[PDB]
Design a protein around this ligand. Sequence first.
Ligand code: ADP
Ligand code: ADP
Ligand code: ADP
Ligand code: ADP
Ligand code: ADP
Ligand code: MG
Ligand code: MG
Ligand code: MG
Ligand code: MG
Ligand code: MG
Lengths: 371, 371, 371, 371, 371
Amino acid sequence: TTALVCDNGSGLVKAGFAGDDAPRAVFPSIVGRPRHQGVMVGMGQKDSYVGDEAQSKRGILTLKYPIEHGIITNWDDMEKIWHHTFYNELRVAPEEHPTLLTEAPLNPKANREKMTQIMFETFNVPAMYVAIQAVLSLYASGRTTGIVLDSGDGVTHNVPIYEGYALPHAIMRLDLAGRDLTDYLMKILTERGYSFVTTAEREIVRDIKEKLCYVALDFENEMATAASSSSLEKSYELPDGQVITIGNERFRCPETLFQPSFIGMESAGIHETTYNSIMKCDIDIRKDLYANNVMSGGTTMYPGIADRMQKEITALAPSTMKIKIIAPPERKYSVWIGGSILASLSTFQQMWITKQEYDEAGPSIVHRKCF
Amino acid sequence: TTALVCDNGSGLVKAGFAGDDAPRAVFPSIVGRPRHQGVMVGMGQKDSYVGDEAQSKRGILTLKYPIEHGIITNWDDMEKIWHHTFYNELRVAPEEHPTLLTEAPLNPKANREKMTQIMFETFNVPAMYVAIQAVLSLYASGRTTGIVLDSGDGVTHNVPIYEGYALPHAIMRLDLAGRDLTDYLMKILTERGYSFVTTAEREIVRDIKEKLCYVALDFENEMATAASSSSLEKSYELPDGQVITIGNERFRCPETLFQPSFIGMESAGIHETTYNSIMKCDIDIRKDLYANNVMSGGTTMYPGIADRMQKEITALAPSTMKIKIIAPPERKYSVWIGGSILASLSTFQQMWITKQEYDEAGPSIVHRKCF
Amino acid sequence: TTALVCDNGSGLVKAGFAGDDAPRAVFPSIVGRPRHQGVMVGMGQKDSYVGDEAQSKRGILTLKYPIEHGIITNWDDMEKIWHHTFYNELRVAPEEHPTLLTEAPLNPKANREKMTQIMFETFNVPAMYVAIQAVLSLYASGRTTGIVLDSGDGVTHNVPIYEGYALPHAIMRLDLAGRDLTDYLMKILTERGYSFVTTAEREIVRDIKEKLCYVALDFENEMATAASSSSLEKSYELPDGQVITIGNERFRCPETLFQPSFIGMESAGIHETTYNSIMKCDIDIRKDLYANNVMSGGTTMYPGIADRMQKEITALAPSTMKIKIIAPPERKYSVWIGGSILASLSTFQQMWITKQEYDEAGPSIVHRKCF
Amino acid sequence: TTALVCDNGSGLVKAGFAGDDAPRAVFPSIVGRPRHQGVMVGMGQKDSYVGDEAQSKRGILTLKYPIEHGIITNWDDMEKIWHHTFYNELRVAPEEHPTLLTEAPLNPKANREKMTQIMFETFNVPAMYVAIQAVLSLYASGRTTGIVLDSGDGVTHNVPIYEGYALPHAIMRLDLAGRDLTDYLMKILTERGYSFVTTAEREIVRDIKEKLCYVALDFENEMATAASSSSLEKSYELPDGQVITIGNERFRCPETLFQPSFIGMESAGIHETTYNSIMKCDIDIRKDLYANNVMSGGTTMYPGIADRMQKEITALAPSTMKIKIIAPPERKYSVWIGGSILASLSTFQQMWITKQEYDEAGPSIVHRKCF
Amino acid sequence: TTALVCDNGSGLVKAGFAGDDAPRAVFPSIVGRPRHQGVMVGMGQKDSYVGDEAQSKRGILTLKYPIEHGIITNWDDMEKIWHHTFYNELRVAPEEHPTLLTEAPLNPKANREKMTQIMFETFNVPAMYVAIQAVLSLYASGRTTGIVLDSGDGVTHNVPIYEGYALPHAIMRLDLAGRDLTDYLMKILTERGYSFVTTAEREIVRDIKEKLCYVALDFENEMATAASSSSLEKSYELPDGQVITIGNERFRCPETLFQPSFIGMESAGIHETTYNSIMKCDIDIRKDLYANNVMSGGTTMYPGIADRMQKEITALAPSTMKIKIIAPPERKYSVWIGGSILASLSTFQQMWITKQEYDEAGPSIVHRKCF
Ligand SMILES: Nc1ncnc2c1ncn2[C@@H]1O[C@H](COP(=O)(O)OP(=O)(O)O)[C@@H](O)[C@H]1O
Ligand SMILES: Nc1ncnc2c1ncn2[C@@H]1O[C@H](COP(=O)(O)OP(=O)(O)O)[C@@H](O)[C@H]1O
Ligand SMILES: Nc1ncnc2c1ncn2[C@@H]1O[C@H](COP(=O)(O)OP(=O)(O)O)[C@@H](O)[C@H]1O
Ligand SMILES: Nc1ncnc2c1ncn2[C@@H]1O[C@H](COP(=O)(O)OP(=O)(O)O)[C@@H](O)[C@H]1O
Ligand SMILES: Nc1ncnc2c1ncn2[C@@H]1O[C@H](COP(=O)(O)OP(=O)(O)O)[C@@H](O)[C@H]1O
Ligand SMILES: [Mg+2]
Ligand SMILES: [Mg+2]
Ligand SMILES: [Mg+2]
Ligand SMILES: [Mg+2]
Ligand SMILES: [Mg+2]
């Protein structure tokens, strides 16, 4: 019949039917209340703005993100986003089609149980599933081996997979993603005197970094060139028509991926975290993981991120190993296309968690993995 | 049934029923006592002249204005003007029809409380409301976005509105208006030897500026042309039949709008005040305000005021922004037609402050804004 | 070398060199033609009488005043008065010494331009200046702060000054002065049956008020005492030897200063005009103006005018403010001594309008104020 | 020898030698031009008034503040203030003594580079340093741990410090300070009809809030008491001698500290910002920060601000934590006394940026932090 | 004279003189560098924190462990820990007293040679020895037979001993210890949403498991009780004052001892490893080993670990064998007290490796075992 695949993670909700080549719905997943004055409810001024209208009428709204570090925080408000996706954006009657929800690894169980209970209680979904983003992201390439390095707006995580088996003892999760690169760019742009404070202005810095930034191949040489010369400097126009000149900051923001120290995060970068998750694995595997290192999600679409990563992990692993980094076009949709394949896969149809089965067996059903 | 809308501000009282295309009553709102001799009360010489009779029999009267800078000063005398409006000019029995009164922003609370208490105590109005002139002025265009630049005889003020929301943190109010341009013209006309002193003669200079004056597109070029040549000079006939020649003064009076320094007022002009009230607003809004800059009220009917304003704000804001200044015909009635629409609007009928509700909840009721 | 200072205002021409303690020339500034019969010109009967001879041979002459409300009206006749001052009274050759002319504020520009053009055209003055009487009047005290309340025969005006700066937005000018008090006394003396009609008889009432009148401290008590008793009555001898008894009228004439309604003038008195010109000024100044309120000119030499004024403004201003009214002796010469100081002041010598400079730059030169 | 410490921030310049117990110079740091008329430069009327003379002769001057939100805006005019401090107020020859300048955190680099370049170029300071106000403010207590909550006229900021180490990843900066509380009081005082407009009148509201205001312990109870009763009302005398009655407004102005929504600022209050900057820090630290929460600067001298703050953060943090707020007397001088200690500290003498070192190494020297 | 015994293994350094009943020094053996900012070395901020100060000032430090799996990794940093132990903690002059160092079995020879070379080169120890922890642990009981099951922070190992002879062909070593149980608890506590990431937070989970955890007698029954009921749940307070509720996790962490599969370790548990090391031994011995099964070290102090172990090995070995598990109090000090006895034993004094003997015979001396 149909299946509805939703990348439910932080930032863009991607949703729309399986059996299609691209998402049908993509919208920022923000919720906004009128800031300046209490709502003129007697005249019917709508007090909630979710998804697209919020960004369209950004300046008057307290834009809240209801998913923070991949953990759903506001349950009253996340349900408004699902409400909007099914009834307004897709215009699909949700009681009729199964829904494949997706999650980060190593989340609190309570978040999966609430997310399930709502879908069975208020939307009355007929059948449902919660998958892990890094596994779906692999089907999108057609491969059955690789270390899926998945970035995002909220959570970065690695899931090595081999011969279709999933290794659950070497999943890694960082808390480093586009929201932390945005909160860093908002701090390094004040060195030029541009000062963004409110959430609406954050939704402008979240657009600067999308276009202007690029990953410096060698960070310590570009910190020379950006000091001696101004061919690196580039200019961008704000909504009001004022022009920014962004210069040096243009490549320091993605650098924090590789140096989490910059943001105060005591961690390995993403290059040391892929390498650690490989070294943790058995010695027999590693020559196959090095050859199949797949990337997905935004904050892995900066120009040249692959060409740096491959050099930077090459500097760690032995020189007898060829290292190829599979960064296909449309990484932004990798997880959704993985859902659009896996939901149409003829073997999968036994894994759906039928509403009846949850109603009788109780919420612990959701943690089963008879995959 | 009906609603009575009154522009109660300084200068012309505009009044007459909602559901009509134009005011039914327009009269100068002056009060006058016989000056020269104490009134022959035993013979019944009427000692008060309000509205039209005062201007008709101007020369013998001490014309007082009971509203000064939008603040009602004489409570004994303002009530004579409402008395005259309801009983003599409209000939409407006021106990029967709700009345929508209008106010400047940032007025003292005490002025709204007295104005309410009189309407409920002596006129016994059945239901009443006090609105802000710059919000009503926007409905008159049908728009739901724009920076309402409202001039007048007493108070100039800006109210940006967006998507029907009102931003109350960026209302600005100046104290610069037709009464200050009149008091300036009375001072620059003495350079030609015409000297107007009494209030009756002020009600002649208040008519000179209405007809003779115009806004110079470029002030510093016209101060050349008016020096080298006399095509700029123009002539006007007084009530007694003597002819004035007004020359250079003809365009210096509206110039004080843009240069409040001229009148001793330490302020931005109206071009810097619209621009400041825009810059104060959030960056996301500003491209929409620049496109919807609405004007209202007299002292915004001088020929070419729009065509200067648009150049003068264009000189401030970025050159990527189109700036359109919406100065419709009948700016003089914009606020009244806004009242004639808003009072007939089907959603508004819950906002009336019923007499019973004020009688029980006490005068603090008038500051509520469940709009 | 020298400078010639002239109080050119209405009534007494005061003239004579700077660097002296008192005017050298003081004379009534009247012009007179033989009234009764056309002049016996073939026998050489002199048809013009200016200054002192006119008053000396008053009774046969149509005494005209060539300055009316501080505006020069007869240009053919005012030039006779300057002619007489330089050649006959001072006996000074005017081509040789600079002349500091003085003016009322808010005069028509044309009056300053004609007054300049004559001095450069017919007298061929080498260098010249036109100052404002109320500024000069302040130097006479040595102060650099105060509200200069300047009376006169023609024009009353206020000029607040502070720290040597002049505030040009709070100059006030009334049209109320000794000529209007004379024309009022000529009307209230007919209540006793004395009737003065001709201009010569006006030059007698202008001498009655100088001696007999005084300012009543409390007007409404003296209108009692003058009704119940006759210690207030006083007697004066006319030129022919007839005795007047002036009684009640003795203090009603200066009262019109404080109540311009009496003369049909719709105005604040001088006590409300000083107070209005203070209230107009910035709040930071006012405690300094109240302490430095200077008086000058005749019609401010009536006995007790200061002691009333100080009570009458004390009744307006707040009771925390000390109010001191600086009425020095020789108020009549205050403006002239101010000229005799300012013309000898070493900084001033750059402000002279050299004849060459007017000849080349044209009559608009006279309005410059690089003071 | 000596060291000159200057709190260069917005509002009061505090300056005077290290090794003393209190500033030797304290003056408002305003610059003023004569407003009403263009300066009589040929007579030598001084056209600039900085520091004390400006406030002394307030009413005639366009008081500009050359530091706005801690960012120096007018470079031509700020240099007049340093000129006045060194040559006129301290009468110290600046080529001879090192100067410790102080700054807000997160300022634009360009502001530090200009501020340095001027001190080395025009004053020719022999050696100089730019420190951060919140670090110096801690030495003033003698502590080596605490969350320095520093308010001011321009910028509020938090700097947690622990064991003498500075954590640079949890500095927070708001744009909320005495200038915004003044601009709010000027808006809420119009509810009583007092209307202050010009900058001179702002320098009176900036004195009202200093004396009359106090922080309400419980805002929502005092909004009851101020409604039912008038023991809360208090009265104050203006320079002219008129008395204000300030009532309800008396405690709503400091409330905006805790509720930035009131001023249109979308932010946490200062109570949520200290708590956020603590929660951001590592879990091991927090019990030590709660015990050492230091306050400094004006707008942290309102009566009872500490006793509210301690309750309001106690409502957030866990109840097992004792919270002590160290608000010593002379918070106004905390930063200056910190400079007077740190500039005399024997270890510091290697951190001075010698003029030679800047001349050779170039302006990037100023961002080094070999602290 | 004296002898200095040091448990040099991972986690707590235990040190202090032989001939005493308990260690004199016990401290975490961590090394820490300031994380957040490069050290202010010119001011003398100490850049190294070892032992107790590191844990005391935990939150600002990158806590590194210099011993990893019983192998010394950082030679520059381990020497700082010996430096601190001898000079600061014991305050003993090390050139004067022999030192008995202790080691895991089956270590790389290079680790013993470096450890020896440092003690003879930089500390200049007069005489020294490296013993094996599991042999010393037996003397602590006074027994001369038993299978010493020694746990720790780094290495678990078995050494069967019989009649004082050591069997070197049945030493077993696992890589499973308190550091792996900590890294597992940090992963299972995220199921409740508590997420510990940094090393400082690891030093809090390393304290949770010390107090809250206990060994479930029957794991599969307690996984029932913890599902049906909440008497098992227990609560603990963090340093900041926030309370954890730990529940189910409380007994799954020590379970990984018995099921190394849980941590991804392909191994027998400790119950199968004691049993394998017994079965490997000759049939004549085994009835004596079963009766003398001694435990030592932390991660063998969890409540009830003995009472489970004895049941779980009883399930393997024949039912004719009595099995007694000798878990005395103060297992944490067993190895140190074994050193404090063996170093005072009169026969041992010939086994010291004199400095002279190493200087002449070369580093291969350290592997001799003329025991
Ligand atoms: N073309 C791009 N270049 C750089 N960054 C991008 C680009 N597109 C999106 N991003 C950023 O990547 C982040 C995550 O996007 P996305 O992968 O859609 O999140 P999720 O996968 O959780 O929906 C967002 O901050 C987004 O702005
Ligand atoms: N056609 C005109 N041209 C110029 N000025 C005008 C014109 N009509 C009115 N004005 C002046 O505008 C001022 C305000 O008029 P109005 O807008 O009616 O005041 P309000 O809106 O407060 O009633 C008055 O001084 C009036 O004389
Ligand atoms: N002693 C006096 N008492 C009252 N009024 C006087 C006295 N002297 C002069 N006046 C009147 O004051 C008027 C103005 O005189 P004056 O100040 O000389 O005029 P101006 O200053 O314009 O020359 C004249 O009417 C004069 O008669
Ligand atoms: N006693 C006081 N009570 C309340 N506010 C004060 C007091 N003294 C000063 N202020 C206000 O605090 C603000 C900042 O003062 P200050 O701390 O000197 O600024 P800075 O530290 O930047 O020099 C000013 O607006 C000042 O008026
Ligand atoms: N009372 C206890 N209960 C449970 N575990 C403990 C206890 N005390 C210590 N541990 C843990 O045992 C581990 C090893 O401690 P220890 O035996 O001192 O190591 P070593 O013997 O190598 O010095 C450490 O992780 C320690 O936290
Ligand atoms: Mg994603
Ligand atoms: Mg109007
Ligand atoms: Mg005079
Ligand atoms: Mg400060
Ligand atoms: Mg041990």
